[PDB]
Amino acid sequence: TDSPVLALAKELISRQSVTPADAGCQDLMIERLKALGFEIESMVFEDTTNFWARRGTQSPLFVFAGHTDVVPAGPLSQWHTPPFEPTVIDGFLHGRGAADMKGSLACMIVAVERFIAEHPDHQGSIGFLITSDEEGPFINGTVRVVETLMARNELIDMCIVGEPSSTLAVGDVVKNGRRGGGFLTDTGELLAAVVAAVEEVNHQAPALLTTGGTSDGRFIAQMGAQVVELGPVNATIHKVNECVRIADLEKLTDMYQKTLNHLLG
C-alpha cells in the first residue's frame, strides 16, 4: 500500500492542471488541511485560483508556498508514459509535475499531518500559500495574496518554497532569499532550521545559492519573510518524461517535518 506521500502525489499528477486551470488540485489540498483545522480562504485573481490557509494565531507564522499548475505536456510521441497518468517505474514516479512541483506539494501536506499528529499544540502558526498560475504567462496569485495579507497586518515570518532546488540528490542544494531583499535584519532562523533538517536526513549540508529562485519567492522575501527554496531534483522539469525519485519524496517529506520540529516544535 502506497505511502501517503506517494498516494497524494499520484492524485495530484492525475489532475490536468495545465495553467491556469487547477483540475481540483487545491481542492484536494484544502480537504486535507480542513481535517487538520486550518482556516481556508480561496482567492480568485484574473481566472486563476489560489488559496491561503492558516492554523494557529501566534508568531512566528511559517508558510509553505507553491503552485498546483504545470506546463503543458508537449508532443506525446516523445513520452514513454501518459503525461497526466502518474506511472511508477523502478522507483521513479513519472508524470507532468512530478518534479515541478506536485511531488513537493504532497510532501508538504504529509509533513504537516505528521507534525500535527506529534505537536497539536505547536508554537507559532502554519500557513499555506498556493497558486495556480506560476507556470503561465500571467503570474499574479502570489503577489495578490501577499498584498492581501500585508494589508491586514498578517506578516509571514518564514517561508519554504518547494520548487525543485536540487541537482542529483534531494537537498543537495537550497536557495536562500535576501530578507527585505538584503535590507532587513535577518536572524538566519529559517536557513539554520532547513540546513539542520537536511543534515539530519542526508548527513550532508546542502550547497547554498543566494540569487535566482522564482519571482514569487523573491517577492515573499522582499516584503519581509525569510525564504528558502528546497525541493526535488530539477533535471526533468519542463521536459518530456518528467519524473521524480520516490525515495527522494520520502526524504523531502522528512526534511519538511524536521523543519517544522525545529521552528514550531
Author numbering: 2 to 266
Which of the paper's sentences describe this entry?
DapE hydrolyzes N-succinyl-L,L-diaminopimelic acid to L,L-diaminopimelic acid and succinate, is part of a biosynthetic pathway that is the major source of lysine in bacteria, and is essential for cell growth and proliferation. All the DapE enzymes characterized to date belong to the M20 family of dinuclear Zn(II)-dependent metalloproteases. In order to examine the role of the catalytic domain of DapE enzymes and the role of the active site loops, we have engineered the HiDapE and the DapE from Vibrio cholerae (VcDapE) by deleting their dimerization domains. Removal of the dimerization domain in DapE enzymes renders the enzyme inactive, even though the resulting truncated proteins have structures of the catalytic domain that are remarkably similar to WT-DapE and AAP.
The monomeric state of VcDapET was confirmed by SEC (the estimated MW of 28.7 kDa) and DLS measurements (the estimated average MW of 23.2 kDa). The final models for both apo- and Zn(II)-loaded VcDapET included two molecules of the catalytic domain in the asymmetric unit. Since the structures of VcDapET were determined in both the apo- and dinuclear Zn(II)-loaded forms, it is evident that removal of either the dimerization domain or the metal cations does not alter the overall structure of the catalytic domain. Similarly to HiDapET, the most flexible regions of the protein are Region I and Region II. Region I corresponds to the engineered loop (the connector) where the deleted dimerization domain is replaced with two glycines. A change is observed in loop V, which in VcDapET adopts a conformation that is significantly different from the one observed for WT-HiDapE (in HiDapET this loop is disordered).
